[PDB]
Amino acid sequence: MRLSREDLLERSEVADELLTALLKAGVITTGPGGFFDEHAVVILQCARALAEYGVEPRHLRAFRSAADRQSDLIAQIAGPLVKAGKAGARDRADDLAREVAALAITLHTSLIKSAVRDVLH
């Protein structure tokens, strides 16, 4: 989805001032057309909950820098697979790259959960 700023605030139930803080810290960004996506809703809701635990938007800036680097590693794997999707009537040619990107994200997420478990216990 393509959400305006106001659409994002309504869906997230977060204050405009928190969104402004997250934008100015580079944590959240608009997509290339200047809209927000569905992930922005979740990011803003998590950021609000985290602010309530004393974590200010500027302290999430590292998460974003790391996410961008990981996204590039994932694109290296999935990008060349865009052309390899089945293109029959019933197919959509992007599905294979999406599947591969999703596997990589799941892998990565699980690695972080694992590493966190270990450092907190």
Q: Does 40 bind a copy of itself (CB under 8 A)?
A: yes
List the beta bridge partners of residue 36. 3
Least Å distance, CB 20 to ligand 8TU, is 26
CB-facing half-sphere around the CA of 10: CA atoms within 13 A: 5
Q: Which of 53, 88, 89, 90 binds a copy of itself (CB under 8 A)?
A: 53
The one-letter amino acid at 90: R
Q: Give the residue among 28, 25, 19, 24 at the shortest CA–CA distance from 48.
A: 19
25 binds, among Na ion, a copy of itself, ligand 8TU, none (CB under 5 to 8 A by kind): none
Are the beta carbons of 16 and 47 closer than 8 angstroms?
no
**From candidates 90, 117, 118, 121, binder to ligand 8TU by CB under 6 A:** 117
Sites of contact with ligand 8TU (CB under 6 A): 94, 97-98, 101-102, 105, 113, 116-117, 120
